[PDB]
Design a binder for this molecule. Structure first.
Ligand SMILES: O=C(O)c1cccc2c1OCO2
Ligand SMILES: O=C(O)c1cccc2c1OCO2
Lengths: 151, 150
């Protein structure tokens, strides 16, 4: 449960890009729809995440965001250690692929309800983070993990 | 002051609107820049907030968002009790006014650094939530909700 570590994950749907940050120890996520994954979009997403949770380390999702000066500048600004996201544990690739599939399935389940993709993605964030698996939810786990770490 | 209670607050800068949700018991915030405060923007912001923290009650920032069918639909969807934001306790007006001024002060302190207002507002959320007063608001909200879960 290393309380400060997050992983970036970028997935595609409807010609659009969904950027996800996963808190690795809990499975809790935040996500956004963007028109394309650029360093600027990723840097802004990181700044938002790190203002909201104590982001110590981020495993970036690809080499272009690992390289990006703009991403490195947001990581410097927000006190984040930027790392690569090489699956030294190969069970990592499989966990992220399954989350993406789960997220896309929830997006499909909420399509009668959202006119824009960005709404369906935030409904999927909500359902993902509140899902009991404990059975604790990922929202409960990340709070428990970080609070234990503060104490 | 319950773990689940938040207050909406809408403030203006640079002819743009900044929408803030404050977790009342900790002072922790999330905020966004929007072109205008409409029911649709407010409903979307609430959906985002409630997928991220366990939002039980929202004190809406004005009667238009309290009334808005779109705001009520997002609160229904996310399981949030929508309430008014009448300051039955008058030290509320002043606590919110003071946060707006501190937020605008930080936005000013980061303007050499951000080309867009939205970046400066998220730098201000970051500095607000990490500021030690000695725990930070980010620490207090985590402690409050974890104590509640346990
Ligand atoms: O239910 C929770 O305690 C919770 C805690 C932290 C974050 C969250 C949560 O629900 C979804 O996003
Ligand atoms: O520093 C923290 O524990 C913290 C915890 C939860 C949320 C946050 C935080 O800092 C910024 O936003």
């Amino acid at each position: 449960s290393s309380p400060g570590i997050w992983q970036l994950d970028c997935t595609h749907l409807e010609g659009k890009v969904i950027l996800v940050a996963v808190h690795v120890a809990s499975g809790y996520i935040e996500a956004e729809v963007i028109p394309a994954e650029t360093g600027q979009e990723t840097a802004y997403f990181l700044l938002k995440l790190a203002g909201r949770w104590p982001v110590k380390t981020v495993h970036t999702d690809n080499g272009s965001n690992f390289t990006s000066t703009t991403v490195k500048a947001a990581c410097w600004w927000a006190g984040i250690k930027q790392e690569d996201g090489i699956p030294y544990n190969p069970q990592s690739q499989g966990v992220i692929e399954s989350m993406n599939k789960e997220l896309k399935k929830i997006i499909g389940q909420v399509r009668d309800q959202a006119e824009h993709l960005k709404t369906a993605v935030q409904m999927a964030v909500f359902i993902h983070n509140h899902k009991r698996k404990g059975g604790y939810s990922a929202g409960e786990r990340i709070v428990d993990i970080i609070a234990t770490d503060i104490q």
